């Protein structure tokens, strides 16, 4: 029975992973914009 497998747990995790990484990436861009607006 290939193709059958239940993915709900993984598809959720992937939406989190996308939501997480996107969030994390802006924080860092913001952190460097702060750091540049602080001590450049």
């Amino acid at each position: 029975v290939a193709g059958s497998m239940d993915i709900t747990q993984q598809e959720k995790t992937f939406a989190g992973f996308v939501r997480m990484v996107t969030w994390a990436a802006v924080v860092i861009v913001a952190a460097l914009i702060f750091l540049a607006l602080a001590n450049a």
């Binding site: 029975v1 290939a2 193709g3 059958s4 497998m5 993915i7 993984q10 598809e11 992937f14 992973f17 990484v21 450049a40």
Partner: protein, 264 residues
């Protein structure tokens, strides 16, 4: 024999071992090429690797046509490529760091106390609107051409625009590296002996290597559309092509607003 999971199990494969023999020889031969001896040992390696890569990726199509790329497997292959893209960003960050440092605090004869002049004294930069904006319109257009190709296969199943769009994208992609290989010919400063030349030619240099890769990758996806290989549900290879290509665009847009606009 008797399994309930969708996960891809693989038969043994030579290519991991074969690629790393070739890759060792490639890099060993490159060291010797860099020190006067013949490029031949290096390019044996390159050929053995490029032969292995070819074999490898041909099976990741074979398996997808074999019906190994189930829902989870295809999903997993999507993370794998995103994690890769992320570590591509971390590679480029080392070069944006090296540029922004020697731009914000360039080295002056009284260095840590009082900084020097940027752009370096007597380095004549590129006009950021004359040519570089031509390349920024070359890429931004090719990025639209590859997205129309995606939206075609995924949301229209229209195999004509998929092929047409990709051909236009591959064309403008190869055109960028051609137009860029003129910006290198017409460079108003050297590669060796100054940081600006070092930061410039290495940063756009690797991006150009990534464009070359992204165009070859898109061509493999078009070659497959020629053989009618994708469906609206199963197109991980085609998916990663437009991701990788859109990543290259983000990198250039940074380079443009970093090295050319802000750093002229």
């Amino acid at each position: 024999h008797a399994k309930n999971h969708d996960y891809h199990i693989l038969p043994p494969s030579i290519w991991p071992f074969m690629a790393s023999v070739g890759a060792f020889v490639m890099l060993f031969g490159a060291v010797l090429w860099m020190h006067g001896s013949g490029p031949w040992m290096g390019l044996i390696g390159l050929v053995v690797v490029l032969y292995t890569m070819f074999g490898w990726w041909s099976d990741v199509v074979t398996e997808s046509l074999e019906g190994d790329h189930t829902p989870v497997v295809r999903l997993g292959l999507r993370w794998g490529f995103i994690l890769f893209i992320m570590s591509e960003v971390m590679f480029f960050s080392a070069w944006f760091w090296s540029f922004f440092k020697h731009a914000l605090y360039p080295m002056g004869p009284e260095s840590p106390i009082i900084d020097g002049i940027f752009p370096p004294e007597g380095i004549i930069t590129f006009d950021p609107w004359h040519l570089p904006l031509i390349n920024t319109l070359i890429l931004l257009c090719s990025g639209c051409a590859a997205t129309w190709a995606h939206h075609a296969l995924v949301h229209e199943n229209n195999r004509r625009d998929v092929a047409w769009g990709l051909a236009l994208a591959i064309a403008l992609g190869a055109l960028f590296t051609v137009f860029q290989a003129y910006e290198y010919s017409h460079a108003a400063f050297g590669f060796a002996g100054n940081i600006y030349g070092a930061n410039f030619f290495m940063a756009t240099g690797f991006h150009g290597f990534h464009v070359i890769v992204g165009t070859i990758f898109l061509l493999v996806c078009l070659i497959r559309v020629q053989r009618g290989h994708f469906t609206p549900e199963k197109h991980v290879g085609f998916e990663a092509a437009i991701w990788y290509w859109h990543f290259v665009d983000v990198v250039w847009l940074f380079l443009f607003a970093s090295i050319y606009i802000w750093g002229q």
